[PDB]
């Protein structure tokens, strides 16, 4: 009994003004992925190689085409579309606090109880998005099941972590850049 219904966002229009945040958070997300990969001794390679630990995306975000940028911008647009569809407000209230990638540390950012509660909704929606997609993939490949095809609330803490973390990162980066997010 799991029928994931992620919020529909095909006809949600992100206001033009948010493009600056999208680009900035996309760069950030690429730079954090790059940091992680590099500290584990990955380097730039023209092709992806797990043995050689090379990756073509280990280069500056500014050097990317629009297609490569879109790898990072799409999921963020999907997040923002869901917030908008839920009729949350995102307004720039304040000025914000903010190959060798040095991404700003978001570890010192505290979210209010209320932003943490919003993060829970975004986290579940990520779960539903993953879930609905996984159902489609399993059908296309002949059936079967997956242990995480359960309601988000029934997941363990360990199981909730990755969705919670993505949601947290979005809201902390919104906060760090001076944005106020309310229900």
State the domain count.
1
Terminal residue distance: 29 Å
SSE ordering? HHEHHE
What is the overall number of helices?
4
Family: Belongs to the ryanodine receptor (TC 1.A.3.1) family. RYR1 subfamily.
Sequence repeats: 1-98, 99-183
Subcellular location: Sarcoplasmic reticulum membrane
Protein name: Ryanodine receptor 1
Give an overview in words.
The chain is mainly alpha-helical and 183 residues long. The protein has one domain: Globin-like, CATH 1.10.490.160. The chain is 49% helix and 4% strand. It contains four helices and two strands. The chain has a two-stranded antiparallel ribbon. Helix 1 (19-39) packs across helix 2 and helix 3 (113-140) crosses helix 4. The longest helix is centred in the C-terminal third of the chain and has 28 residues, at 113-140. It is globular and about 50 Å long. It is found in: Sarcoplasmic reticulum membrane. This is Ryanodine receptor 1. Sequence repeats lie at residues 1-98, 99-183. It comes from Oryctolagus cuniculus (Rabbit). Belongs to the ryanodine receptor (TC 1.A.3.1) family. RYR1 subfamily.
